[PDB]
């Protein structure tokens, strides 16, 4: 179905994981992809602004293997209930990234593959209808350099 959002999710999570020294390979087995670069900078900036107003997102929620999934869906649903904009989509990515980074630090590597899967499915089922009806992913690159 060419849901290449998977590639976007993995690319973003790999970047966040690489920052902490890990590799995406450890947890899981037309070249206009400047969105990859655009999303990384955006994610970095979001986390920077978030960690200034509050504590960094990596220490916001207390996670356990059995708590993770219900906690992820609960957050995302409340984030997108009153509307969808490009800022909240960046919030969506940097949140999932913070979860992966935390889950590894708290030694719950099992979640990393799933967080990606959780993000990818929601990005296909509930967000892409908004994406191309707002100009696709390039529009994001244009508006946010």
């Amino acid at each position: 179905m060419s849901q290449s959002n998977r590639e976007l999710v993995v690319d973003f999570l790999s970047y966040k994981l690489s920052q902490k020294g890990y590799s995406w390979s450890q947890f899981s087995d037309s070249e206009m992809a400047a969105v990859k670069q655009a999303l990384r900078e955006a994610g970095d900036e979001f986390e920077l602004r978030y960690r200034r107003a509050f504590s960094d997102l990596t220490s916001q929620l207390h996670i356990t293997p059995g708590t993770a999934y219900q906690s992820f869906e609960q957050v995302v649903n409340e984030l997108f209930r009153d509307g969808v904009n490009w800022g909240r989509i960046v919030a969506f990515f940097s949140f999932g990234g913070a979860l992966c980074v935390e889950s590894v630090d708290k030694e719950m590597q099992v979640l990393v593959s799933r967080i990606a899967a959780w993000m990818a499915t929601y990005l296909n089922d509930h967000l892409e209808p908004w994406i191309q009806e707002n100009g696709g992913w390039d529009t994001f690159v244009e508006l946010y350099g």
């Binding site: 979001f46 957050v75 949140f95």
Partner: peptide, 21 residues
Amino acid sequence: HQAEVQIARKLQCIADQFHRL
């Protein structure tokens, strides 16, 4: 009983004001 919504709102607070690139 969720502190998850508080996180979602904190996310929205920065996300909403994120149009000023």
